[PDB]
Amino acid sequence: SYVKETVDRLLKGYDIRLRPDFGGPPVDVGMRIDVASIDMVSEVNMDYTLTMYFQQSWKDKRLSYSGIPLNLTLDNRVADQLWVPDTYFLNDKKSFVHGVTVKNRMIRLHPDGTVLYGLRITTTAACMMDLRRYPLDEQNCTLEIESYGYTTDDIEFYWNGGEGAVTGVNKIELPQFSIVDYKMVSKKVEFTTGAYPRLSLSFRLKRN
Amino acid sequence: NMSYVKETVDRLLKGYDIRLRPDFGGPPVDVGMRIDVASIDMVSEVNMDYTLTMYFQQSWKDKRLSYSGIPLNLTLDNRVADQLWVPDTYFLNDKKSFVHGVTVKNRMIRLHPDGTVLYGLRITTTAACMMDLRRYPLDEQNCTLEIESYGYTTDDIEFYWNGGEGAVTGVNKIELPQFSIVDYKMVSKKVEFTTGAYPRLSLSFRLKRN
Amino acid sequence: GDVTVILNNLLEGYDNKLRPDIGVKPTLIHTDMYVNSIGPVNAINMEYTIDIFFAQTWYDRRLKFNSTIKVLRLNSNMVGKIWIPDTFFRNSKKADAHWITTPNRMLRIWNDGRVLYTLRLTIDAECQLQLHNFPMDEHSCPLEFSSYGYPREEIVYQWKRSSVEVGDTRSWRLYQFSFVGLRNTTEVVKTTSGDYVVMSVYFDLSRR
Amino acid sequence: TVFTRILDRLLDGYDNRLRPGLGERVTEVKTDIFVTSFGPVSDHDMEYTIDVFFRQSWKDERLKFKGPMTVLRLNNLMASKIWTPDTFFHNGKKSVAHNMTMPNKLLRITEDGTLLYTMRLTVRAECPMHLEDFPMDAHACPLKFGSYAYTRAEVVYEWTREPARSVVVAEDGSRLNQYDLLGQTVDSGIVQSSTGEYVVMTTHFHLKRK
Amino acid sequence: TVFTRILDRLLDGYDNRLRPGLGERVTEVKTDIFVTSFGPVSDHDMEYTIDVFFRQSWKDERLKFKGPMTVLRLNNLMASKIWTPDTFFHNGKKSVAHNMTMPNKLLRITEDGTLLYTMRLTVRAECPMHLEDFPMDAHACPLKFGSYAYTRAEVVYEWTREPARSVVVAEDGSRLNQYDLLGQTVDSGIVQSSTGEYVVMTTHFHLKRK
Ligand SMILES: *[C@@H]1O[C@H](CO)[C@@H](O[C@@H]2O[C@H](CO)[C@@H](O[C@@H]3O[C@H](CO[C@H]4O[C@H](CO)[C@@H](O)[C@H](O[C@H]5O[C@H](CO)[C@@H](O)[C@H](O)[C@@H]5O)[C@@H]4O)[C@@H](O)[C@H](O[C@H]4O[C@H](CO)[C@@H](O)[C@H](O)[C@@H]4O[C@H]4O[C@H](CO)[C@@H](O)[C@H](O)[C@@H]4O)[C@@H]3O)[C@H](O)[C@H]2NC(C)=O)[C@H](O)[C@H]1NC(C)=O
Ligand SMILES: *[C@@H]1O[C@H](CO)[C@@H](O[C@@H]2O[C@H](CO)[C@@H](O[C@@H]3O[C@H](CO)[C@@H](O)[C@H](O[C@H]4O[C@H](CO)[C@@H](O)[C@H](O)[C@@H]4O)[C@@H]3O)[C@H](O)[C@H]2NC(C)=O)[C@H](O)[C@H]1NC(C)=O
Ligand SMILES: *[C@@H]1O[C@H](CO)[C@@H](O[C@@H]2O[C@H](CO)[C@@H](O[C@@H]3O[C@H](CO)[C@@H](O)[C@H](O)[C@@H]3O)[C@H](O)[C@H]2NC(C)=O)[C@H](O)[C@H]1NC(C)=O
Ligand SMILES: *[C@@H]1O[C@H](CO)[C@@H](O[C@@H]2O[C@H](CO)[C@@H](O[C@@H]3O[C@H](CO)[C@@H](O)[C@H](O)[C@@H]3O)[C@H](O)[C@H]2NC(C)=O)[C@H](O)[C@H]1NC(C)=O
Ligand SMILES: *[C@@H]1O[C@H](CO)[C@@H](O[C@@H]2O[C@H](CO)[C@@H](O)[C@H](O)[C@H]2NC(C)=O)[C@H](O)[C@H]1NC(C)=O
Ligand SMILES: *[C@@H]1O[C@H](CO)[C@@H](O[C@@H]2O[C@H](CO)[C@@H](O)[C@H](O)[C@H]2NC(C)=O)[C@H](O)[C@H]1NC(C)=O
Known part of the structure; x- marks a missing residue:
């Protein structure tokens, strides 16, 4: 009743093509990944297949509402009507958002403005493999999480939760390899075009 | 002046019926094929198929897309192909085909002051080839590629090779790792079904096993 | 065109972006599936494929119409105009719907507001062959689903029939093992986004 | 010019979501199948391949007109703006x-x-065989199809010609390597599910090894 | 607040399908690349993988503005409206x-x-490989690209920096395992086509088998 017109006024006059705080401070984007599987670490093709619950939370002042003391989990057909960051993966080869019944994509608004975003992505990511020690070698295959068209003067990345920003890794079992450790890396990467933020999630793979 | 051009382009698309072929209810309009063979990619005696990449070009004279002021052969964006009538030409023996989408969908829309629309496509066809495996060192294939309209009878459109023998270009510039092109031949044919009669251009060529 | 009158009147003032009981009730959904086939258990990728007719049933109070027809049968064209709950198979590698010849989406609307909605879905799930005894195999092969965005406060899945609720077909559906029965559970799994109800379906198999 | 006025009239008041005669007669869909090439039968996957011109015909009382032409060979963009049946292959695996x-x-x-x-399809479907007699056996590959969302009280499928003369295989349409397509046999049928009694058109392809 | 109102002033009256300068001077597109990795060569089907940041720059005088921000960093949803050229790779047989x-x-x-x-691509371009010296290979795999529908009189491709410096490979990124990347070599040519005359940017990669 009352909720339907508040959602309709958040989408009235909304300009998707400009980010929050456009022409101002960088919008702060926090990330979290729930690792689902390390399916196919191929030694011939030098890649690994990762299924993950990719999650993004950022502040957006254009999407705040006064009343309604609850969180508006909207349908996934609103994310093409909202601004989302253009976060790619630097070392992907084949990737897709899962379309099981509908497209697996979460939009959960909040009464202050913190848009919560979610995806279920299966990523075939490539990694360098040193095959000198052919048994019992550690691989350290990573996943560079980077945005495409926003310099660090427009966005900032961080692992939302610090060390507890990556869950579900300890529950993974591989038949040949074994997860010994993982670590999260935050940095800035300079190109000819600009300076882009990069998150890096590493996986050392002690082969049995 | 670019302001004069937009007034004419909007004039050609206001009042246009995409679901009507040109001269609808009258004489059939002739569509001429033009094939520029890029490569024979992956010919395989396991799945009885071969992969063909080419520049499928086709031209037809339509009446509604004519203009008088601009002396140029007006080349528009490829998103105008989603706004105009193009023929439903298919390849009867394909198994998996796609238009290349590397930067855009590789389509050409080149209008003319006469009324000739030129339409190009960089498509890759995995056509099926029934290959006789009687004797293996001397295979001597004949792998065909069949151009045919789908939803238009021979009194709705008609096909021809735009240039006779010169409609097929680039087969002499193919370097296959295990095969050799000794001949290629273009066949115009009419084929009837229960639904109607359909025009059929046939692009065929002979292979040889080394 | 009398059905066109009452079908169009269910569309104005109807937001596709909001679940029906958005503030009041947890919007309980009744579900069941018809197991059409269970394909080869490969188990090198820990994968078995399964073809089902996955059905859903919920009450939309915005879709009550006055009793002119008892229930109107819809095609696959009104699914995009009506709120459809997200449902994802948690262990699915590639769960692809069947889209051939005006896709397999069935939709019924009663005058109570009850909505029956089903899909034809082929899945490939996670199931380890449990290789302690390679000739004497046993397997569980779960198939579980949830909503990706709506928590247990906002969505509730429930079986129609108590403790079975799942049909089956003639057992000639390319199974190299022995299909011996069904069992299903219901679990609340805590994640970061919230607490989600999980509807596990088990397909007990054994090699012979 | 004139035909645009016709087609802009045939959609005022028309509804996609309703079969012709809702609350009235059932709709009779006259299904025809022309097999373009009966593809290779995969024995390890236990599924075959077939290329069909899946034809189907029905009467709609909302699309009548009194124009100058009797049959209007329209485009496939028109077909998404009219009601079409929801036919699907009950045993189909990966139908493109x-x-x-x-x-x-x-x-x-x-x-x-x-x-x-009519539609040009490649439907691949299950063909369960019994390998008790492995080097020399003959079995029937089923091709069942019917409606998905409409029961026998909404739609009823039929064959266009006689059932012995409806499904037509082509002359050159055999992509088989091991087996021999020799004959086919169809019948109607009713498969009741949890919703209702759906009609199912069963088609078997009898074929034997070499 | 304000920047919404200024994007509509640039897009009202802008035609999405007309290149900047139709009937005027030739559009000059300035091309840069950045090879993020040089993927593994395939000796079987004679191809290689490469993923680049494929940069382009041209002057659209219809998009000049006066605002508080110096440049406008916009989304990809904006880029669907602005005219962008049709730059396809002549060697690319499959691209993502x-x-x-x-x-x-x-x-x-x-x-x-x-x-x-710019856009992040992946090109499965093909090498015409000479295997007369199979243990001691020394290849030069091309990466030709140019326009599809626009003639040399309509668009002209140029390199942004000096052409020896206008191609960049990543310092620590290359997925070669049997070869090694000796270095790059650019060239600029003109392909005489059946449609017209097209500028072609050629880029070579010199390899040697380890
Ligand atoms: C990266 O880029 C690629 C390429 O651009 C993107 O791929 C495209 O993604 C879009 C968005 O999802 C897809 O569009 C939608 O497609 C729906 C189904 O389309 C089917 O098309 C053919 C058969 O027609 C199949 O081959 C497809 O199968 C492929 O896609 C699935 C998706 O998971 C894969 O899993 C498969 O493996 C295949 O690869 C598709 O099944 C289509 O229904 C939908 O159109 C409805 O919705 C939109 C907006 O709401 C409107 O156009 C319209 O309203 C449509 O609704 C009508 O019909 C529905 C039917 O139920 C009714 O309910 C309505 O009332 C109304 O009448 C939309 O077009 C597109 O198909 C897909 N293309 C390909 C080649 O995959 C990637 O997504 C992208 N990745 C990102 C962004 O991460
Ligand atoms: C089978 O082949 C046919 C080719 O005829 C193909 O049909 C085309 O599909 C595309 C979409 O894939 C259609 O393009 C759409 O056109 C509408 C018209 O208004 C646009 O509004 C749409 O814009 C959306 O996407 C834009 C991308 O730039 C964005 O601006 C925005 O996000 C919009 O939501 C969209 O461009 C095209 O019109 C048809 N052509 C026809 C029907 O003639 C079909 O998709 C193919 N099927 C496959 C590959 O499964
Ligand atoms: C092997 O895996 C480890 C982790 O498992 C990764 O090493 C990380 O490499 C990055 C960049 O190469 C470095 O991160 C740095 O962290 C400091 C703070 O500690 C920060 O100030 C810097 O800006 C930089 O981002 C660092 O060497 C290391 N970091 C961590 C947390 O381990 C990497 O994936 C693999 N490293 C090698 C050498 O193979
Ligand atoms: C591969 O095989 C096909 C058929 O087996 C060959 O196509 C045939 O080509 C001949 C030569 O042109 C055609 O005969 C003539 O056709 C013309 C034009 O249609 C007609 O005017 C003549 O009266 C005569 O019939 C023949 O019709 C055609 N067959 C089919 C089925 O179309 C093809 O030539 C072979 N490939 C090569 C490289 O030889
Ligand atoms: C809506 O979402 C917000 C964002 O998470 C919730 O606020 C936090 O909730 C968690 C767990 O419930 C706790 O840390 C605190 O209760 C909240 N933290 C802060 C900093 O406010 C909020 O509870 C959600 N609303 C509902 C009704 O669940
Ligand atoms: C515009 O297109 C027409 C049609 O193709 C061109 O006219 C042809 O020009 C070639 C020159 O290479 C002649 O060999 C043909 O005989 C011409 N055909 C006709 C029907 O005139 C014309 O040259 C093009 N003009 C421009 C400026 O691009």
């Missing part, structure tokens, strides 16, 4: 709709009101 | 324009009218 320069569909609306909507 | 959360495309409109536009 062939998409090309235009999608391979057709729609010939008639002044009587009867339609003709 | 990557999208993960949005399409990986940035559009940066400067105040002057010039605008940078």
Whole structure:
């Protein structure tokens, strides 16, 4: 009743093509990944297949509402009507958002403005493999999480939760390899075009 | 002046019926094929198929897309192909085909002051080839590629090779790792079904096993 | 065109972006599936494929119409105009719907507001062959689903029939093992986004 | 010019979501199948391949007109704006709709009101065989199809010609390496599910090894 | 607040399908690349993988503006409206324009009218390989690209920096395992086509088997 017109006024006059705080401070984007599987670490093709619950939370002042003391989990057909960051993966080869019944994509608004975003992505990511020690070698295959068209003067990345920003890794079992450790890396990467933020999630793979 | 051009382009698309072929209810309009063979990619005696990449070009004279002021052969964006009538030409023996989408969908829309629309496509066809495996060192294939309209009878459109023998270009510039092109031949044919009669251009060529 | 009158009147003032009981009730959904086939258990990728007719049933109070027809049968064209709950198979590698010849989406609307909605879905799930005894195999092969965005406060899945609720077909559906029965559970799994109800379906198999 | 006024009239008041005669007669869909090439039978996957011109025809009382032409060979963009049946193959695994320069569909609306909507498909479906007699056996590969959302009280499928003369295999249409397509046998049938009694058109392809 | 109102002033009256300068001077597109990795060569089907940041720049005088921001860093949803050229790879037989959360495309409109536009690609371009010296290979795999529908009199491709410096490979990124990348070599040619005359940017990669 009352909720339907508040959602309709958040989408009235909304300009998707400009980010929050456009022409101002960088919008702060926090990330979290729930690792689902390390399916196919191929030694011939030098890649690994990762299924993950990719999650993004950022502040957006254009999407705040006064009343309604609850969180508006909207349908996934609103994310093409909202601004989302253009976060790619630097070392992907084949990737897709899962379309099981509908497209697996979460939009959960909040009464202050913190848009919560979610995806279920299966990523075939490539990694360098040193095959000198052919048994019992550690691989350290990573996943560079980077945005495409926003310099660090427009966005900032961080692992939302610090060390507890990556869950579900300890529950993974591989038949040949074994997860010994993982670590999260935050940095800035300079190109000819600009300076882009990069998150890096590493996986050392002690082969049995 | 670019302001004069937009007034004419909007004039050609206001009042246009995409679901009507040109001269609808009258004489059939002739569509001429033009094939520029890029490569024979992956010919395989396991799945009885071969992969063909080419520049499928086709031209037809339509009446509604004519203009008088601009002396140029007006080349528009490829998103105008989603706004105009193009023929439903298919390849009867394909198994998996796609238009290349590397930067855009590789389509050409080149209008003319006469009324000739030129339409190009960089498509890759995995056509099926029934290959006789009687004797293996001397295979001597004949792998065909069949151009045919789908939803238009021979009194709705008609096909021809735009240039006779010169409609097929680039087969002499193919370097296959295990095969050799000794001949290629273009066949115009009419084929009837229960639904109607359909025009059929046939692009065929002979292979040889080394 | 009398059905066109009452079908169009269910569309104005109807937001596709909001679940029906958005503030009041947890919007309980009744579900069941018809197991059409269970394909080869490969188990090198820990994968078995399964073809089902996955059905859903919920009450939309915005879709009550006055009793002119008892229930109107819809095609696959009104699914995009009506709120459809997200449902994802948690262990699915590639769960692809069947889209051939005006896709397999069935939709019924009663005058109570009850909505029956089903899909034809082929899945490939996670199931380890449990290789302690390679000739004497046993397997569980779960198939579980949830909503990706709506928590247990906002969505509730429930079986129609108590403790079975799942049909089956003639057992000639390319199974190299022995299909011996069904069992299903219901679990609340805590994640970061919230607490989600999980509807596990088990397909007990054994090699012979 | 004139035909645009016709087609802009035939959609005012028309509804996609309703079969012709809702709350009235059932709709009779006259299904025809022309097998383009019966593809290779995969024995380890236990599934075969077939390329069909899946034809189907039905009468709609909302698309009648009194124009100068009797049959209007319209485009496949028109077919998404009219009601089409929801036929699907009950045993189909990975059925691709062939998409090309235009999608391979057709729609010939008639002044009587009867339609003709054919599709070029590659449906692959289950063919369970019994390997008790492995080097020499003969079995029937089923091809069942019927409606998905409409029961026997909404739609009823039929064959266009006689059932012995409806499914037509082509002369050169055999992509088989091991088996021999020799004959086919169809019948009607009713498969009741948890919703209702759906009609199912069963088609068997009897074939034996070499 | 304000920047919404200024994007509509640039897009009202702008035609999405007309290149900047039709009937005027030739559009000069300035091409830069950045090879993020040089993927593994395939000796079987004679191809290689490469993923680049494929940069382009041209002056659209219809998009000049006066605002408080110097340049406008906009989404890929903006880039679907602005005219962008049709740059296809002549060797690419399969390519993936990557999208993960949005399409990986940035559009940066400067105040002057010039605008940078790049995309993250992956090109499975093919090498005509000479295997007469199979243990001691020394190849030069081309990466030809140019326009599809626009003639040399309509668009002209140029390199942004000096042409020896206008191609960059990543310092620590290459997925070669049997070869090694000796270095790059660019060239600029003209292909005489059946449609017209097209500028072609050629890029070579010199390899040697380890
Ligand atoms: C990276 O880029 C690629 C390429 O651009 C993107 O791929 C495209 O993604 C879009 C968005 O999801 C898809 O569009 C939608 O497709 C729906 C189904 O389309 C089917 O098309 C053919 C058969 O027609 C199949 O081959 C497809 O199968 C492929 O896609 C699935 C998706 O998971 C894969 O799993 C498969 O393996 C295949 O690869 C598709 O099944 C289509 O229904 C939908 O159109 C409805 O919705 C929109 C907006 O709401 C409107 O156009 C319209 O309203 C449509 O609704 C009508 O019909 C529905 C039917 O139920 C009714 O309910 C309505 O009332 C109304 O009448 C939309 O077009 C597109 O198909 C897909 N293309 C390909 C080649 O995959 C990636 O997504 C992208 N990745 C990112 C961004 O991460
Ligand atoms: C089979 O082949 C046919 C080719 O005829 C193909 O049909 C085309 O599909 C595309 C979409 O894939 C259609 O393009 C759409 O056109 C509408 C018209 O208004 C636009 O509004 C749409 O814009 C959306 O996407 C834009 C991308 O730039 C964005 O601006 C925005 O996000 C919009 O939501 C969209 O461009 C095209 O019109 C048809 N052509 C026809 C029907 O003639 C079909 O998709 C193929 N099927 C497959 C590959 O499964
Ligand atoms: C092997 O895996 C480890 C982790 O498992 C990764 O090493 C990380 O490499 C990055 C960049 O190469 C470095 O991160 C740095 O962290 C400091 C703070 O500690 C920060 O100030 C810097 O800006 C930089 O981002 C660092 O060497 C290391 N970081 C961590 C947390 O381990 C990497 O994936 C693999 N490293 C090698 C050498 O193979
Ligand atoms: C591969 O095989 C096909 C058929 O087996 C060959 O196509 C045939 O080509 C001949 C030579 O042109 C055609 O005969 C003539 O056709 C013309 C034009 O249609 C007609 O005017 C003549 O009266 C005569 O019939 C023949 O019709 C055609 N067959 C089919 C079925 O179309 C093809 O030539 C072979 N490939 C090569 C490289 O030889
Ligand atoms: C809506 O979402 C917000 C964001 O998480 C919730 O606020 C936090 O909730 C968690 C767990 O419930 C706790 O840390 C605190 O209760 C909240 N933290 C802060 C900093 O406010 C909020 O509870 C959600 N609303 C509902 C009704 O569940
Ligand atoms: C515009 O297009 C027409 C049609 O193709 C061109 O006219 C042809 O020009 C070639 C020159 O290479 C002649 O060999 C043909 O005989 C011409 N055909 C006709 C029907 O005139 C014309 O040259 C093009 N003009 C421009 C400026 O691009």
